[PDB]
DNA sequence: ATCGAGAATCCCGGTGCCGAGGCCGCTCAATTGGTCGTAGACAGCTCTAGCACCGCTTAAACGCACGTACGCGCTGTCCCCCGCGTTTTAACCGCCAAGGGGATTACTCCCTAGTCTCCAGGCACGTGTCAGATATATACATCCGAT
DNA sequence: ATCGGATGTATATATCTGACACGTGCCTGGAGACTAGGGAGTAATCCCCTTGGCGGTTAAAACGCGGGGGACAGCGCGTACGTGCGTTTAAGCGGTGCTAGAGCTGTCTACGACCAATTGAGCGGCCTCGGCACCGGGATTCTCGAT
């Protein structure tokens, strides 16, 4: 079985508390009603640039693995660097 | 003793101009804004074919490394039609 | 005699809380088939490593916080202390994020 | 032997200058054959576009000769030269006439 | 006799002309000058092309212009039609300039 | 002689021309101490890209700065320029 | 031979590997030839540039007491100097978090 | 067999020894050391590229990295570097 | 106006355990030592292009008045979002299974640096127009009172 | 809410003038025809590390329910800056002069790749325990509802 596995918000995820614990990371004290969708499709936008970009990195050396050296080189490249993996 | 010179992209700039519209020319600032771009575009995707080839332990910039970086610079439409009509000048050189 | 502190102190002790701490927010398995899901358009059938996942999760994480620290910034430079979405519609058209 | 000809490229934007200029500029220690026909074919498609875009709105100034002002509106009205081409000034270019909507004077 | 025009009437025909043309707008010789007095403190007894001083009134007014944009957009969303300092101080901090 | 009373080269930016680089940015109206801060940003940015073109040109020995040395010292601090060479 | 096997960091009086950084000099094509003493000179930068980081990063480990630098402390410890914010400014670094900044409206309005 | 990687960690913690002697640090710090090192390396090894590529030479000397240094550091952070490069470089002439 | 529940937060103490640090083999990349064409410091000219200077016109900058409208503080009024108990529910965790695909090592071989010569493509250099700025005179488009 | 000065702005027409499209000459970099070592496609395997499933608990998420404070529209009142006209005034122009230094070309030379033998040095495998968690108990501090 599953139990429940229904994920629903097909890309909700980020739960509404999750956007809110971000949120009070980056010291935020009190977050509108329409904040959370809009939360969801601009995570949405800068993940599809990431791994649009870092999908063309596994493509290029002809492997079906995306590796953590991908993603890092393609969010250098987005001029976002990221240390901590390579 | 004369002197020295320097090359462009004038003429061939204005090759691709008289393919378009033919009748209708083109002014200097405005060419070498177009030079520089064209150097600049050069230099965005060569760079990008250096910092690729720079991953996968190789040497040699091919044509493929080419097409991955413009799939990774143009933005979508004209990455399509410019990726296309690369396939179109690879296969149309070597087919002859 | 039930009485909560108010509106503000669970939000101020908590940004003590949340900017003090370290860790990773958003919950492993709902981001992971997020990534996987997103990644399905390009190419069909993937496989990630686990801790490409966690590098996702750490760039996506500080793209958000950082939207949210400038953002914060434009709605208190509308004299209000409320985040409101033509805001975040001012910082990714300021940034340059607005494509 | 050499009973040959000159005529070799026939094709468009010169593969041979490319060709020097990816050879040496060190990018990589050897480069392929195929690759600057490659790179000059995209250069001639982007180069193509942005002067049509500068052709018909050069027209649209009634003129026939572009100047940079056809190059600047040229490359901002359409989204994905711009989005290329975002972070380059070009000079002599100046503004697409953007007007903020409160700043439009109403009335009745 | 009035004839005058509303306080704005002289500023969005401006905003026309001056969005609509295209030339050089600081004076040459004051810019020319303030090129050299900024420069002589990093070395002294300097030569400069005149096009190089035409090159850094383009990024003068590139980055001044762009940064009236922002600072625009930043006083608009205060329902402010008037830019005041700590609106420009907010798109450079935006930016990332301090 | 002619009058040649000029002093305070930054003050030289005249306060028409900040009006006038306001109204082709499409600012209807100016506040009282714009023109200052005006003045003092004009200043950092010209002090930072012409501390960066002395660096690339007493890095060729030369005494006198080209226009290429400051489209490069325009380039690199991701500010670009074309229309005078590279 | 032998002639005093002798390496080089000692020769300069430093603690980092001139020949592997001479040698990721010359094997990522910058230029064709690569000179005499170049990777000595960028190896003193980039050991003055570590000195600096470590040693922030060790001030601030003990002035959260540790006796270990964690990731959380070169996030706070770079981001409190000036300079070495402004050369790492387009740069994240994971399990960092963000150092505490509050906005003076936040703070409470009591007397 | 397995293949051999290279790192800078042991002179990253080298330098530890010499700043604070008697203080750890933790793994993913070391990482995070070992990629600003690169980061730093390609920066300045870029600049040294096409600083060196302006000029028409083919040849990076100690001279273009001093300049490159002087592009990428700001400031107080370039003096002291240039010092301590200028006191490597002869410190190594002078045997 | 100033004082107590009380709840969150900070201060020691044993535990554990495991990740930080260190030690022992050990392949190989640094090292040392010669050569060698050559990139480049170095000298000197040249001439050209940047700097200096002086007089004239004047667009532009400066400065005074003025008024209204833009900023901004107070007032009320609503509601959306913050806070907290209650359910649930799906994420986290341990472990067990299977293999598809990354990494490796080898194999073979086509291919792209490298050479030398051959020539026309483009590029320096006169040149003279037809495209555009500049008046120059001329009838619309919309602004601004005043009705 | 319409009408008219008026007024800035769009619409032919000449007109000089000069910037660009173009023709002449040249020279060197594109190219063409070879060779050769090596980078890399290509096969096969090793195994490991990604995926998958399944059960057990439960921190977190969802959700319902107060309630108040934060957004926001109105609104009055000040001030500062946009508008426009007289004054100045130095910026642009436009020529004239002088020579400092970019750039060229040649001279001569100290220096980086090429090999090529030699070796310890950093790296992986493999221990080992002390510092950070981590409960676990306990006094401090701060907040929030009272005086």
Do not use: W
């Not at chain 2, 090359?7 to 101009?17: D, G, P, T």
């Not at chain 3, 953002?71 to 910082?91: E, F, G, S, Y």
């Amino acid at each position: 079985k599953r139990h429940r596995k229904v994920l629903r918000d097909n890309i909700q995820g980020i739960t509404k508390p999750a956007i809110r614990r971000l949120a009070r990371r980056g010291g935020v004290k009190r977050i509108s009603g329409l904040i959370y969708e809009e939360t969801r499709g601009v995570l949405k936008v800068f993940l599809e640039n990431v791994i649009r970009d870092a999908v063309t990195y596994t493509e290029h050396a002809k492997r079906k693995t995306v590796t953590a050296m991908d993603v890092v080189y393609a969010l250098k490249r987005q001029g976002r660097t990221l240390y901590g993996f390579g | 003793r004369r002197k020295t010179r320097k090359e462009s992209y004038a003429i061939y700039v204005y090759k691709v101009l008289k393919q378009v519209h033919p009748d209708t020319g083109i002014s200097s600032k405005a060419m070498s804004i177009m030079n520089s771009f064209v150097n600049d575009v050069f230099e965005r995707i060569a760079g990008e074919a250096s910092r690729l080839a720079h991953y996968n332990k190789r040497s040699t910039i091919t044509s493929r490394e080419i097409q991955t970086a413009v799939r990774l610079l143009l933005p979508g439409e004209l990455a399509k039609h410019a990726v296309s009509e690369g396939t179109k000048a690879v296969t149309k050189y070597t087919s002859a | 005699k039930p009485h909560r502190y108010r509106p503000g102190t669970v939000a101020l002790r908590e940004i003590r809380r949340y900017q003090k701490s370290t860790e990773l927010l958003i919950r492993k398995l709902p981001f992971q088939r997020l990534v996987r899901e997103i990644a399905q358009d390009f190419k069909t059938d993937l496989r990630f490593q686990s801790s490409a996942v966690m590098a996702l999760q750490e760039a996506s994480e500080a793209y958000l916080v950082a939207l949210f620290e400038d953002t914060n910034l434009c709605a208190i430079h509308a004299k209000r202390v409320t985040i409101m979405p033509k805001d975040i519609q001012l910082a990714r058209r300021i940034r340059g994020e607005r494509a | 032997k050499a009973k040959t000809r000159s005529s070799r490229a026939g094709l468009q934007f010169p593969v041979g200058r490319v060709h020097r200029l990816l050879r040496k500029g060190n990018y990589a220690e050897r480069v392929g054959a195929g690759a600057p026909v490659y790179l000059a074919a995209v250069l001639e498609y982007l180069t193509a576009e942005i002067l049509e875009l500068a052709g018909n709105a050069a027209r649209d100034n009634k003129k026939t000769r572009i100047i940079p002002r056809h190059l600047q509106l040229a490359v901002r009205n359409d989204e994905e030269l711009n989005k290329l081409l975002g972070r380059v000034t070009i000079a002599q270019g100046g503004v697409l006439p953007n007007i903020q909507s409160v700043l439009l004077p109403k009335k009745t």
